[PDB]
Amino acid sequence: GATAKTINDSVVTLIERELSGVKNLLYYSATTDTSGTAEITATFKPGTD
């Protein structure tokens, strides 16, 4: 029941800050829409388990 802005300001930033430092991480992205949910996808280097 929240706008994308609220979730981005409250939830996404804190999670992505710690997610940034995972080993063998090629990159990480985050998405927030009007559905009240947020997603964070961490793409690791090819060949990683």
Next chain:
Amino acid sequence: YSEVDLSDYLVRNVVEELKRVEGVGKVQSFGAEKAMRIWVDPNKLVSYGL
């Protein structure tokens, strides 16, 4: 400016980006963000019964 404003600017902007730099294990802030402080006088409160 004053030391509250400097701390607010440090926490709001600087620290967040500094953590993003490579090799930065952690950042500990020695200042606090701005907040709405209500300093209540107990003597006045009892006068109105609140």
